[PDB]
Amino acid sequence: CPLMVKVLDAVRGSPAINVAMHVFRKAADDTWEPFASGKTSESGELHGLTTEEEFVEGIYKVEIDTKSYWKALGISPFHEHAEVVFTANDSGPRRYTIAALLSPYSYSTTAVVTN
């Protein structure tokens, strides 16, 4: 699993379940082409987005549909989405977890990059 996304909810103290997201890879003309997408599981995790062979060096964007999540909970949110943009680099074997902790007017995102 070269790339996994985990989303938590800071209002309810729980995984953020059924959060949709799309992953994009930056093309040579600086546009964003779709790469993978899915919705978080009951654990707040989205697995299986890509494979080692496909996940080459480049700039990637994860767009997490936080607005729909808060709307489904009846809570007014600030952001249209949470966007995480990063370069994937080959420095030995690397697995990436992109994590996001969500509140209606704030989010915190980190990366856990391991071998």
Ligand X SMILES: CCc1oc2cc(O)ccc2c1C(=O)c1cc(I)c(O)c(I)c1
Known binding residues for L-thyroxine are 6, 45, 108
- Closest contact distance (angstroms) between CB of 44 and ligand X is 7
Is 43 among the residues that bind a copy of itself (CB under 8 A)?
Answer: no
For residue 110, give the 3-state DSSP assignment.
Answer: strand
- Closest contact distance (angstroms) between CB of 48 and ligand X is 16
Q: Gaps (C–N > 2.5 Å) in the chain: which residues precede them?
A: none
- Residue from 3, 8, 19, 21 touching ligand X (CB under 6 A): that is 8
Laid out side by side, the sheet with 20-26 consists of 32-39, 20-26, 58-64
Instruction: State which residue, 42 or 90, has the beta carbon closest to a copy of itself.
Output: 90
